[PDB]
Amino acid sequence: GVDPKHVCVDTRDIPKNAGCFRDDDGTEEWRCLLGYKKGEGNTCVENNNPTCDINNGGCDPTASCQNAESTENSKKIICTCKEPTPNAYYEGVFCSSSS
């Protein structure tokens, strides 16, 4: 349990429209940046029509998801990590609630 700043060292090749995060438990995972979705299993691709539903729109359940529509795909899904999550895994695609 710590503030989400764990950063990452994951996976051979993490998708360009993606980012990896290595969590508190020591896990190594990657996800698809906000306003993006999963393509060929291990690729992230700009969704440009993101909905809140899909992993909170691309957020972490500890990242308050707000569905919105903006010129930017990354500005469509709003991921807000709460007080016990002072940090965000990448853009808020994931967060850690144990700081």
Side-chain angles (χ1 to χ4, degrees):
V2 78
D3 49 294
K5 47 75 187 306
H6 316 82
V7 304
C8 176
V9 281
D10 173 54
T11 280
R12 311 81 49 198
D13 168 68
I14 296 137
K16 185 192 183 68
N17 297 211
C20 84
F21 190 92
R22 169 173 230 205
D23 72 8
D24 204 277
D25 188 68
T27 315
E28 295 155 70
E29 186 63 68
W30 61 255
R31 293 203 195 234
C32 300
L33 307 203
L34 305 177
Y36 301 1
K37 78 287 182 180
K38 196 67 95 283
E40 66 171 293
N42 280 333
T43 48
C44 297
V45 287
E46 274 178 75
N47 56 30
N48 285 211
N49 196 92
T51 182
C52 198
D53 187 275
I54 303 173
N55 206 87
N56 329 314
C59 315
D60 190 277
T62 70
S64 173
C65 165
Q66 327 267 90
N67 41 330
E69 52 179 270
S70 182
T71 177
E72 313 221 289
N73 46 82
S74 192
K75 299 290 294 178
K76 307 193 201 309
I77 301 303
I78 301 80
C79 313
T80 297
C81 318
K82 288 70 175 298
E83 299 187 90
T85 72
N87 309 271
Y89 305 0
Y90 225 111
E91 321 207 299
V93 185
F94 10 2
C95 328
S96 194
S97 40
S98 49
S99 56

